[PDB]
């Protein structure tokens, strides 16, 4: 679209938001991380949306850069869908986080928060666990809706790219 | 600046991400909230950065809208500075959160996480508390650096506004 200056800023901002959400989602939280963290999606996917900011400098590289960014957006939207299900229906992919992050949270998990001792269902300890699980669900669904936002804007470009080529 | 199309997108994106960080920071986390939540800064401040997107439609209202958005950016940067100190040096402003948010976290706090029982310093319960405190520090410092990002871009406009007027 002609708004490609206005759109290239949007891609860059979506990149920085992913990087910020990634660093936030990399804050120590226990044994298992979301797949998004261990795939490092917000880092490499974030900077890829910065790099598609190349189109602000309005060659076959750019066709590759835009197409490469579309794969990142799609894969990120899939990864964030997976982690929300990973959190709320079944911890089906037990991504063992990162040991330099587990170092600060070595005895702790958020993929289960039911206490083995039912007296503790009332306990502050249990409310803390469900708080972090709710924050991770929040961060992932925020990352998803911005990952979906990338798909819309990259579609509005690459749909024109290959019809121009 | 002439890039005001590219800049108006940046303002809108900074608005949406403040709203997302606000809703994330409004996820139930205990008795006390950050001041940013109880001031509702990410909601009203976020939509104000959407509204300064009026300059994408390139009158004295716009001079007021830009100047009003600059107050929001400055006040947000101050508020997020305050909450980081509120979390990490002294809980000096005990913003009693919101009762519809406390309903899910009625017995719990993150402005202190030292257990009254020193045996519990090792406990998972204590690691959960410090995890949420670290996440809130993370969310606030992410919100701060984007609140600071607004000041830079609004300065690059209102510095021209009043010299044009």
């Amino acid at each position: 679209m002609r708004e490609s200056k206005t759109l290239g800023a949007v891609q860059i901002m979506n990149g920085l938001f992913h990087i910020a959400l990634g660093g936030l989602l990399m804050i120590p939280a226990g044994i298992y991380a979301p797949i998004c963290v261990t795939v490092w999606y917000p880092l490499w996917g974030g900077i890829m949306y910065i790099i598609s900011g190349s189109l602000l400098a309005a060659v076959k590289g750019k066709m590759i850069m835009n197409s490469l960014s579309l794969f990142a957006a799609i894969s990120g939207m899939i990864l964030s869908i997976m982690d929300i299900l990973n959190i709320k229906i079944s911890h089906f992919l037990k991504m063992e986080s990162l040991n330099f992050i587990r170092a600060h949270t070595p005895y702790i998990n958020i993929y289960n928060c039911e206490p083995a001792n039912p007296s503790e269902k009332n306990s502050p300890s249990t409310q803390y666990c469900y708080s972090i699980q709710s924050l991770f669900l929040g961060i992932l669904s925020v990352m998803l809706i911005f990952a979906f936002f990338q798909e819309l804007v990259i579609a509005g470009i690459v749909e024109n790219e290959w019809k121009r080529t | 600046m002439r890039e005001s199309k590219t800049l108006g997108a940046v303002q809108i994106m900074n608005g949406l991400f403040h709203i997302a960080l606000g809703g994330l920071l409004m996820i139930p986390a205990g008795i006390y909230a950050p001041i940013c939540v109880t001031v509702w800064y990410p909601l009203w401040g976020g939509i104000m950065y959407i509204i300064s997107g009026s300059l994408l439609a390139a009158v004295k209202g716009k001079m007021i809208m830009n100047s009003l958005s600059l107050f929001a950016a400055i006040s947000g940067m101050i508020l997020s500075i305050m909450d980081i100190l509120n979390i990490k040096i002294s809980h000096f402003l005990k913003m009693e959160s919101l009762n519809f948010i406390r309903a899910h976290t009625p017995y719990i706090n993150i402005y202190n996480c030292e257990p009254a029982n020193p045996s519990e310093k090792n406990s998972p319960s204590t690691q959960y508390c410090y995890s949420i405190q670290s996440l809130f520090l993370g969310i606030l410092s992410v919100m701060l650096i984007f609140a600071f990002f607004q000041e830079l871009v609004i300065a690059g406009i209102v510095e021209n506004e009043w010299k044009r007027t």
Partner: antibody
Framework: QVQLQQPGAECVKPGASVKMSCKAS????????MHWVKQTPGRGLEWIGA????????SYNQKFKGKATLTADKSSSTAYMQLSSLTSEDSAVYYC??????????????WGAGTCVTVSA | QIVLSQSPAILSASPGEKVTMTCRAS?????IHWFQQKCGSSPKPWIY???NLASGVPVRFSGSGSGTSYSLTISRVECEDAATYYC?????????FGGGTKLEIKR
């Protein structure tokens, strides 16, 4: 003093169900979690679940969440476990155990003698 | 859900020899508890909170470790020590037991 009494053996039919008791004595029954642990020579010790008799809250191991049904009577001071839909693989020794919080962790500090269950036609 | 791996599965030592048996957790746990079981007995609590001997456990025993690697060690074994020892963790729901180490004594 503190003691958990269990019926020593139950012999039951496939598809049937069995209820086994755990009579607490010598302590405030309602103030502690009562846990149930399966033992089989081929699988070791598997935690089944727990009940807090104070309110009545239960938690279950996911691999047992439809096999066991934990209940407790405040008055007789007795915990119960019902096992549904019994199969050969339910043949085991079942211990009740009382968990205290002690030394900075939960602790199975007293155990029942165990109930031998075998499921056979 | 944490797997506790005990080594060796079978251990033997002559009376007065020193032994160590190890429990390795598939993830780091706050503490490991050890239980002694003899044939036809229920498990007895033996060590709690990684290192505290249960009531009446001989100071002959001690327990140590941290993170993912724990051990129980007996300075000088005796015939009353012949048993199966299970490690156990509370750090995750469900609590889980190790496969046991069977100690038998080379009298």
């Amino acid at each position: 003093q503190v003691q958990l009494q269990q019926p020593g053996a139950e012999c039951v039919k496939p598809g049937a169900s069995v209820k086994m008791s755990c009579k607490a004595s010598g302590y405030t029954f309602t103030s502690y979690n009562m846990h149930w642990v399966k033992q089989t020579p081929g699988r070791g010790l598997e935690w089944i679940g727990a009940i807090y008799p104070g309110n009545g809250d239960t938690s279950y191991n996911q691999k047992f969440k439809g096999k066991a049904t934990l209940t407790a009577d405040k008055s007789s001071s007795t915990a119960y476990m019902q096992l549904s839909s019994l199969t050969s693989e339910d043949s085991a020794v079942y211990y009740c155990a009382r968990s205290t919080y002690y030394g900075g962790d939960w602790y199975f500090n007293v155990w029942g003698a165990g109930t031998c269950v075998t499921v056979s036609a | 859900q944490i797997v506790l791996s005990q080594s060796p599965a079978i251990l033997s030592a002559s009376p007065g020899e020193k032994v160590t048996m190890t429990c390795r957790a598939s993830s780091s746990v706050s503490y490991i508890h050890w239980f002694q079981q003899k044939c036809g007995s229920s498990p007895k609590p033996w060590i709690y909170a990684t290192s505290n001997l249960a009531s009446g456990v001989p100071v002959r025993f001690s327990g140590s470790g941290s993170g993912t690697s724990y051990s129980l060690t007996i300075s000088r074994v005796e015939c009353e020590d012949a048993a199966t020892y299970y490690c156990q963790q509370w750090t995750s729901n469900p609590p889980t037991f190790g496969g046991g180490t069977k100690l038998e004594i080379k009298r």
